[PDB]
Design an enzyme around this catalytic site. Structure first.
Site, PDB file in Angstrom:
ATOM      1  CG  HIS A 100      -2.063   0.912   1.212  1.00 20.23           C
ATOM      2  ND1 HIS A 100      -1.924   2.275   1.048  1.00 20.23           N
ATOM      3  CD2 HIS A 100      -3.390   0.688   1.388  1.00 20.23           C
ATOM      4  CE1 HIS A 100      -3.113   2.848   1.129  1.00 20.23           C
ATOM      5  NE2 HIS A 100      -4.019   1.907   1.337  1.00 20.23           N
ATOM      6  N   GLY A 101       0.572   2.201  -0.898  1.00 22.48           N
ATOM      7  CA  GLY A 101       1.331   3.442  -0.938  1.00 22.48           C
ATOM      8  C   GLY A 101       1.231   4.185   0.390  1.00 22.48           C
ATOM      9  CD  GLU A 121       3.744  12.645   8.698  1.00 21.49           C
ATOM     10  OE1 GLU A 121       3.458  12.613   7.482  1.00 21.49           O
ATOM     11  OE2 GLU A 121       3.348  13.554   9.460  1.00 21.49           O
ATOM     12  CG  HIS A 127       3.671   5.612  -4.421  1.00 23.31           C
ATOM     13  ND1 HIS A 127       4.204   5.456  -3.158  1.00 23.31           N
ATOM     14  CD2 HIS A 127       2.516   6.301  -4.258  1.00 23.31           C
ATOM     15  CE1 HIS A 127       3.410   6.033  -2.274  1.00 23.31           C
ATOM     16  NE2 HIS A 127       2.378   6.554  -2.915  1.00 23.31           N
ATOM     17  NE  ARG A 150      11.749  -2.759  -8.901  1.00 26.29           N
ATOM     18  CZ  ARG A 150      11.803  -3.229 -10.141  1.00 26.29           C
ATOM     19  NH1 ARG A 150      11.473  -2.451 -11.162  1.00 26.29           N
ATOM     20  NH2 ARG A 150      12.198  -4.474 -10.362  1.00 26.29           N
ATOM     21  N   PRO A 151       6.596  -1.212  -7.788  1.00 24.09           N
ATOM     22  CG  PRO A 151       5.634  -2.902  -9.085  1.00 24.09           C
ATOM     23  CD  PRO A 151       6.371  -1.579  -9.200  1.00 24.09           C
TER      24      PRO A 151
END
EC number: 3.1.2.-
Lengths: 138, 138
Positions: free
Chosen positions: B55-56, B64, B90, B92-93
């Site tokens: 998940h991004g 953070e 983002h 790359r997966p």
């Protein structure tokens, strides 16, 4: 390592600025390495904000200029690139001389890219950090 | 050169995660240098999005978390910091294993701060680039 797909010279690079915002602000491409692109911009009436400091918009414009061109040099005949997302953090103010922008790649995809652009003052101090995302239309 | 103004061990750092989102996501501080902080996070059911990839929002949370703690070790008794501006790209997966975030300063001001956070997959490939601005109160 050389990353550029299009091999151009500084003279040719600067020739593209003619009659655009790039020339209007005095931006001049000044260095082309194997994986880096640099350009300098003046801090005067053309890029000033009220008090006499460098306008936050000029730094942003310099970053947008470098990222777009570097992105273009990564494309092949028939392809095109466009800036899609920009962010920038103003760390320190500048009021005289010229600033120098240094552009380097963070990610190089065949569909899109991400470029870093750090802006330094003539004392070598980092005054602005930017990142530009681009999309390849090829 | 040593930048930190608060001196804490990795053991003390991880102890602060108790009963917070940091522990909830299994994030662990794994390295503390003179001018850098690192942490690792698992890529599993706790941090996946509906399609099975990381998940991004998890990558953003890791960033953070890192910038905030580094900001904290930059203050002295009585003072406090707070995240104000965060952005992330983002690139790359990732779907399994764990990722590693590396946090370093870009600008350290008596009033403001700017931190860089890069997240790598197990192969050492850059998967996400972030920047967090923080405010120091007191």
């Amino acid at each position: 390592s050389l990353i550029w797909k299009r091999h151009l010279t500084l003279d040719e690079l600067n020739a593209t600025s003619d009659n655009t915002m790039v020339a209007h602000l005095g931006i001049v491409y000044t260095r082309l390495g194997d994986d880096v692109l640099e350009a300098e911009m003046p801090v005067d009436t053309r890029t000033h904000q009220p008090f006499g400091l460098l306008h936050g918009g000029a730094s942003a414009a310099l970053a947008e200029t470098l990222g777009s061109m570097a992105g273009f040099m990564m494309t092949r005949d028939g392809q095109c690139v466009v800036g899609t997302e920009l962010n920038a953090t103003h760390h320190r103010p500048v009021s005289e001389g010229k600033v120098r922008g240094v552009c380097q790649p963070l990610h190089l995809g065949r569909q899109n890219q991400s470029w870093e652009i750090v802006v330094f003052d003539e004392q070598g101090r980092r005054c602005c950090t930017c990142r530009l995302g681009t999309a390849v239309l090829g």
